[model samples]
Target chain A: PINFHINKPFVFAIREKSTGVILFIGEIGEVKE
Target chain B: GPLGSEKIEKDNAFAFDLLQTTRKHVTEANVFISPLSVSMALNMTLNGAAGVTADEMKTALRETGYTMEDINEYSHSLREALLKVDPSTTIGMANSIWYKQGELVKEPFILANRTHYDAEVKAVDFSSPATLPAINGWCAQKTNDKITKILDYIPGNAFMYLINAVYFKGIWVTQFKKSDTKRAPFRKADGTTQEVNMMAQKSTFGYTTDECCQYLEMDYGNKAFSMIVMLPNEGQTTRDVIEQLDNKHWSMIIKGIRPTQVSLRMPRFKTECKYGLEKKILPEMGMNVPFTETADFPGITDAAIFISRVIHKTFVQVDEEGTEAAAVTAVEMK
Candidate 1:
């Protein structure tokens, strides 16, 4: 298993496979165990 | 008091020239860049340039009117003035230089930047996996997290990165209320219309009109800075207005603007622009040698090194409330 800590926000995006269209974009501001 | 309108006019001319060149590369697309950020980053690079390379950079920047010493002084004073402009307005600028560890970067170059531009100079291991995050972290923090990264990976041959980040958040002097916003038909350059949320307001703004375009200046809070918008006239295209924009016409446009009641309908918009300046933009501006092997950057390293890339990213959001803009420019040397 790999473990990493993100102390700051990061963005994630999802896109359509065939059309290459971006469907959603979101930012993860915080993560906690 | 130190740098007069004439000096500012010269800088404006340089900015306009750079914009014209940039527009040529990004045809039919929205583009926005903070010329100040690019200029500062390049000025720091110029601190390391020597011989013909220096001459070409000065020409590209239109810095023949002032010496490097004069330019440094102006930059120093300008940063101070911008920081002290208004406490209510948030305007932040930060510059940094990251070089490969064990590289023989000249001491004078670092000293000049640290003294004049207040740049942070760091020697980091470019080969280290953590270097990317460190550089990205600096970019994100400097731009208030608006721009997260200026680079994806550092090249094996990369020697240095000179970066400048600027962030601005300002409320309008006369803020537009959300209640006045309405759906309006906005016409595109291609004669197409789309419904957009247009903020409507009637206020006294600095306005002027000429044969080519209509100019309006909307003051930000405390009146320390203002956003000037120039819209093409009914029969004129943006290209026409852009072509006509030179130092002389620009000065005239600013001088002709007078406070008048304007019923403005501004559309709420957010835009982000990214460019690799080394590809076509900088060469088109006559700074070609820096991208070639013949380029001389003795101040950075004694080895044969030249600029590999100049990446620029900018984001701007304008709404009924005010404006928030951030820009970052990175000069990669290899």
Candidate 2:
């Protein structure tokens, strides 16, 4: 039996010139199959 | 299997809904950029979404508070404006450029445009915790969560943004019985090598092998879509694979994937990249001109300044347990 495992951490960043407001934040976690 | 389901769902949703959502967000921001323009282009080139229905188009426009009349008017205006600009000069500029401590800084407008509008990417130190995340957060908020954080850090000044998606997944078409894993050597893109823990299985599998590389396609169940793992031949390099990779080769490589069981060993990796719709790539792709300064950007700024640039950065890590991916997209308006 293969005790396979996979994990990854992803992040995205952006800066808006006009508003000076930083927008959008998220994280995806995938486990199981 | 979850990944496949997620992929199918994301793909289907993007096909039917992401455009409208993106368009609405872009317009609402009042940024002098073209999400719809890039969206349309991306759909055409990457997703193969040809002619959409009137209903679909309307739905997308509705989010931006635009009517059919507005679309027609804008299209006409864009056509006329692009005709006047020297398409080459406008498009040859870089979409993103970095800044260093002592590097010459352009004027605010120029720097903003150069950093995000028309410029080049500058390499930065990723290991420095003081650097990237906050900027990533700033971008995430501007995009209204369409993206989250900058995956990589361009230290000196700026980074280019590419309009694309990063996906990673794997599965056992004929799962290993959980008894055949062995530690083995995994050659990395770098010249050095390391031994890593790997899963081994043997059964009827969906696989393809060639002089250049070997690939295995495993279903995620539910026919949601599958993950294809490409393994370069021993001594071969990632650069070599990338050099020879093309849509044609990609199509052929994925054509045959039969369900089978066999020994399998794979290692997880981390990759981060930033992309943008640049003047260089745009012109090469037949988009001869830009809508930045010379053209009328009535949609947002209502000035000669068109979209300064579209910035996107993505970071992802894959390990033994699962996957984590994050990305940020920004439309720099002048």
Candidate 3:
């Protein structure tokens, strides 16, 4: 499970199982909820 | 179970070492090289190398904790895993070997490379001008035309070439609107300012700061791949940050990263770099034996074959949309 805070910047990657191939990589600088 | 944390850590250390060595050669310039591509190409070549040649390459690659067999298995499995990681992300890798026609290469060497690296081995007439375009075509195709060519001309004495090409294209999970891009002043390494189009965005980024540098990680499409950027501290230059970075320091910094709100102002830039590593860079990295006549590559051929040149080219573009990068490495043996 992953959590994201609207006020905090988070770097997240959608990784797959077994092999750690990072499918998508991004940095969120600002989120408005 | 094979792609464990320990293997990942070793991979990171090897990447850092290669970057450190590359930085030493290209000072004060925006440089990018796919250590993966270089390492894969070298590993393919290592299949045909024996004795001192093999040992030197292993040391230069920093394969201290793992044997050649271990490295091969890891590289092969990792490539297989990355190819199918996600549908949205585009990451492609290709390897090939072009040997001079009529040259008698060892059967075991060919078998090893074919099995481990999945390299497309072919015997081609290097003397023909058409062969150059054929080789370049493979490179361009693998990189989605991002890297058009890796070889300018095939040397007459060249006996074989082991090549690797890698391409990556990923979109940001949170897209940056084009309306936010604006012209801003960017300070160069020499303390000179230049007008550049800087992209501004507000996003949650994994961020950390230390005495030397500020680290930020941005996630790409589906959050499977990300680019980690390190900016030097106020008083520190890029060179200072680079020189101070090692495997241990990098490991610590990555571990320290935490999610934080960031008002990021990033420059939209595209750059390309090319290098011929046979002269100063490869030798400095302790791969001198392969270039000398005394080089022992008996597994490749009975004829004295030594590495004549190693050419690498890279292209990278980062903008509000995402990042697109490609690299090609060619190891010419003669």
Candidate 4:
């Protein structure tokens, strides 16, 4: 499966899969995860 | 706190792990703990993430997308789930998952739903034989393959479950000047000194000290987020300092912080944990009973299936340079 990399220095993504819509988006700091 | 700052330069190095397997193997989508569940969850998460509370959950949820109603409603639902998973006492369930994309059509669901797109809702229940692998598989995907696999199969007799995973990764806000990170004098709690690679950096921060501890505050960006780091005086433990810290003291420390230049020094460290929690630390933390009995969870299923177990796992790594961490907690909601 394709890795849905939520790639960013500090990114948080919440997706509502039903509609494939993105929910709240946020980021802070430079920590990578 | 250990023996010497050199031999044991870092006092806090711990990892707590837990894992729960249900006979009904199904996909476990997400796992989270609320602030109220923090205390109970901390018994395990402390080694991974510490000092998180319910108020923080409320604040974080609201700041993210949840309204007061959402929080309250979810809290009620989680409480019911917890009661079903552990009935002897108040072990609450603050995190959960909805696998079908259609179920995630709402605010929180958007974030937690695991399926890639809208599809037929699988009739998978927590008691289904397909639940365990499904849940673990989802966890592995969400964490970027960090946790490749967990729980070979579900316990044949298990009905419901609860789990918590904690991870902590701390990176120096102001990375130590690499040139200065060399062998240096590190004072130990026992008043001894040893030479260690102590990372040091000269950075501007909100610095202050008082009778209890010395603290430094650093802003991430545009003051949108900040990290307050406090170092206790010699002979004082971080746990002790944390115990004494409340909202009042926290507010005072924040208010007292003033922009100033200071030399910051710390050790580079990281740790992770994974294990099952039903028998280890839950009962001792006031959540006396497990939540598997019929009276505990009515919304879960019609049968008298009780929560059979809880499983959790976490990963965290922090160095003077940067940090990386992730965790998952699953509750087999049959």
Which number leads on DockQ? 3
Instruction: Report how closely model 3 matches the true complex, as a DockQ value.
Output: 0.07
User: How far off is each candidate at the interface, as Cα RMSD in Å?
Assistant: 21.7, 15.3, 9.9, 17.2
Q: Which stretches of candidate 4 lie over 4 Å from their true place?
A: A1-33, B1-134, B149-153, B159-173, B177-179, B184-197, B275-285, B289-295
Candidates 3 and 4 compared by DockQ, better number = 3
Error of 1 at B150 (Å): 0.8
Off by over 4 Å in 1: A1-33, B1-4
Each prediction's DockQ against the real complex? 0.02, 0.04, 0.07, 0.03
Give one digit per residue, the lDDT tens place, for model 3 in B141-209: 998888898987787788999998888888987777889977766656555556677677877888887
Worst 10 residues of 2 chain B by lDDT: B42-51
| lDDT (Cα, tens digit) per residue for candidate 1, span A1-33 | 111111122222221111211111222222211
- Ranked by DockQ, top first: 3, 2, 4, 1
Tens digits of per-residue lDDT, candidate 1, B130-190, equal 9999999999999889999999988888889999998888888899899998876666555
Native contacts, share recovered per candidate: 0.00, 0.00, 0.04, 0.00
In candidate 4 the C-alpha lDDT for residue B123 amounts to 33
Candidate with better lDDT, 1 vs 4: 1
Over the stretch B62-122, how does candidate 4's per-residue lDDT look in tens digits? 2223333333334343334333431222121223332322221233322222121111123
> Candidate 2, residues B1-334: lDDT per residue as tens digits?
3222332222222222332232223312111122333332222121111123222323332212333334333333332333233222111111232223333332442333332222234433434575467445544543444356645544232322222222222232344433455565544333344565555544444677667666665443222223455555555543344345433454566566455455555444444444454434333333322323343323212233333455555444434443344444444333
Interface residue Cα RMSD of candidate 2 after superposition: 15.3
lDDT minimum window of 10 residues, candidate 3 chain B? B1-10
Q: B11 in model 3: Cα distance from truth in Å? A: 3.2
